[PDB]
Amino acid sequence: LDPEEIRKRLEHTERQFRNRRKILIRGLPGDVTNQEVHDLLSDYELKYCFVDKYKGTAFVTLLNGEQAEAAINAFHQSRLRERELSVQLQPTDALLCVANLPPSLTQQQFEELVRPFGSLERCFLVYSERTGQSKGYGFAEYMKKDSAARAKSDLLGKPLGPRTLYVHWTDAGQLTPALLHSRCLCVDRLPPGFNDVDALCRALSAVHSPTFCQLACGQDGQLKGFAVLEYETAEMAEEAQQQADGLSLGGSHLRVSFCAPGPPGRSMLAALIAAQATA
Amino acid sequence: DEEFPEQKAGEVINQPMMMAARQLHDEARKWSSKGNDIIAAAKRMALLMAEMSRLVRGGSGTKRALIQCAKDIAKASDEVTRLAKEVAKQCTDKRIRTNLLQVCERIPTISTQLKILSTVKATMLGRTNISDEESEQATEMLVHNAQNLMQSVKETVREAEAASIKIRTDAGFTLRWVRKTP
C-alpha cells in the first residue's frame, strides 16, 4: 500500500464525510413563503427547498457544504421580518452503514452497490488510518429516507462475494471521525457446534482484552456459528482484528471482521442474531 | 394545505393558542384559496397563530417577533373583515347577512386588542423583575383574545360560505367555495 494512495483514499472519505450541505432554518414567520426563502438565499445555489409552514422551519439543500457553512454563518441569528432565525445543519435522515463488505471491495464498487436506491448525498468506505485498507464497512446517505429503507431492505443479507452484508441504521446518532471507527468485531467460520468462548475469548486477547465477548446463541436455543467482541478503543479493535483473522482454533481457520460502529457488543450480537434469523 | 401535526415534548408552546390555531386551520383547510381571499388570509392567520403559540413561551428575539406577529395577524384579519362585508352586501338572506355582519364587526376590535396584548406580553418576555402573576395574567388575556379571534374568523368563514348560495342575482362580488379533497 503506497502512501500516496493511502492519503488519497483517506482524503476522499473526508471530503464525503464532511460534504454536509443540508441546512435547517427555524424561527421563520408563520406566513413565510418559499419565494421569501429563495430570496434570502439568493447568493447560494439551492438544490432543494421545503418549508414546513406549521413549524416555521425550512429544509434547504445547498450546492455543497461550503455554501451550507456560508449560509449558516451569514444568517444564523439574523432577522427576517422581525423574526430571529436559527440556521444550522439538518439532522441525519437516511444514513446507513453497510458492513461485512469484502475487505477488497473498492470505494467505486461500494458506490455502485449502494447507488441504485436513490440519489446519494454522501458515500464512503471506512479505511484504517495507517494501512489505508478498507475496514469492510462504509456509509451511504440518500437524499430521501425512502431510499434508505429500500437500500437496507435490499442489502441486508445480500451476498457480495464470499460475504453476506449487514445493514444498520444511523438513527442518526451523530458521528465524528472518531466514531467512524468500530470497537466491535465478529468472529465466524467457527467449528461446528464449537463451544470455546473461554478459548475463543482467550485467543482474542493476544493483543488487547475484550471488554465484551460472547457466542451467538439462538432462541432455539441453538448456536449460530459466530461470536461478537468489543474493545475499549477503535485502535484496540483494529490491532486485535489484524492479528486474529485467519487464526487456527478448533479444526478451523477463523474469519475475523469488524461490526458496524455504534452499538455495543450486547446490541450487535442480538442485532446480528435477529438479522441472520430472518433467513 | 397540509394537516396540522399533533403535540409532543416539545413543544414549548402555549397549548390553548395552538388549539385555537388548529381550529381555524382545520376549517380553512378544506377549501381552495383560488378565488377566495378570505380562505387565503385565514390560512395565513392560523399559521401565524401557531407561531404565536411558540413566541409567547419566551426565548431569543421573541419580543420584536411577537409584536410583529400580532401586527401580521391584525393585517390579515382586516382583509377577512373587508372581504366579509362585501359578501354581506351582496347577500339576500337577512338571517345570514346579519350573522355575517355581526360575527365580523367585532374582528377589528379583537385584533387591536391583540396588538396591545402581544406588546404587553412582549415587554414582559425575559424580565424576571415582573411578578409571576402579572405575566401569567398578561398571557391569559392574550390566550383568551387569540381564542376569540380564531373563533370569530372561523365563523366568518362558515357564514361567508353559507351566503354563497344566497347572493343577489348578477352580484358585483362573489367568493369561490371549492373543496380541496379527494
Side-chain angles (χ1 to χ4, degrees), chain B residues 34-179:
Chain B
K34 227 269 270 293
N36 190 336
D37 282 343
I38 284 179
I39 285 308
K43 294 185 180 163
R44 268 189 256 128
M45 293 178 69
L47 271 356
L48 279 159
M49 194 34 96
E51 162 190 26
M52 207 184 248
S53 107
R54 271 164 226 138
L55 293 176
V56 100
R57 275 300 280 288
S60 189
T62 64
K63 137 164 211 136
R64 285 228 258 154
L66 166 64
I67 286 146
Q68 196 47 240
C69 187
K71 283 187 211 130
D72 294 335
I73 297 166
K75 191 183 162 191
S77 89
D78 283 329
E79 213 190 329
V80 164
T81 311
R82 160 187 90 71
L83 288 179
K85 293 172 175 191
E86 288 311 338
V87 166
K89 205 128 144 111
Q90 310 272 339
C91 177
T92 61
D93 186 276
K94 235 265 194 277
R95 188 202 106 238
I96 296 157
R97 192 176 62 247
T98 288
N99 309 159
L100 197 55
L101 282 170
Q102 286 174 190
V103 318
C104 101
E105 243 114 10
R106 20 208 166 80
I107 293 174
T109 305
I110 307 168
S111 289
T112 312
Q113 316 199 337
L114 192 63
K115 296 188 259 120
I116 288 149
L117 305 165
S118 300
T119 307
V120 150
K121 186 63 205 219
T123 80
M124 311 199 150
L125 291 190
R127 339 223 115 237
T128 347
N129 32 274
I130 196 282
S131 57
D132 266 24
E133 348 146 47
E134 267 191 15
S135 75
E136 142 93 355
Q137 207 33 234
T139 292
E140 292 271 287
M141 302 195 250
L142 185 46
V143 166
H144 156 95
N145 196 263
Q147 293 172 338
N148 296 172
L149 192 57
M150 295 297 98
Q151 179 72 21
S152 289
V153 168
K154 181 175 124 80
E155 287 171 10
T156 307
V157 171
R158 313 194 313 249
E159 292 293 341
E161 186 268 339
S164 80
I165 241 68
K166 309 226 107 233
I167 303 291
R168 54 137 154 279
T169 136
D170 195 20
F173 176 79
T174 49
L175 292 169
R176 167 167 181 283
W177 294 95
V178 159
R179 254 295 210 302

Side-chain angles (χ1 to χ4, degrees), chain A residues 30 54 79 81-84, chain B residues 5 51 54 60-61 64 72:
Chain A
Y54 161 81
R79 288 248 167 210
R81 285 169 29 204
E82 285 303 287
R83 269 81 163 192
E84 189 193 68
Chain B
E51 162 190 26
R54 271 164 226 138
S60 189
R64 285 228 258 154
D72 294 335

Side-chain angles (χ1 to χ4, degrees), chain A residues 7 12 15 57 85-86 183 196 200 208 242 264 278:
Chain A
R7 86 143 240 313
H12 189 284
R15 275 214 287 306
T57 69
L85 313 174
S86 129
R183 279 118 347 221
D196 238 303
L200 191 162
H208 300 78
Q242 184 166 12
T278 71

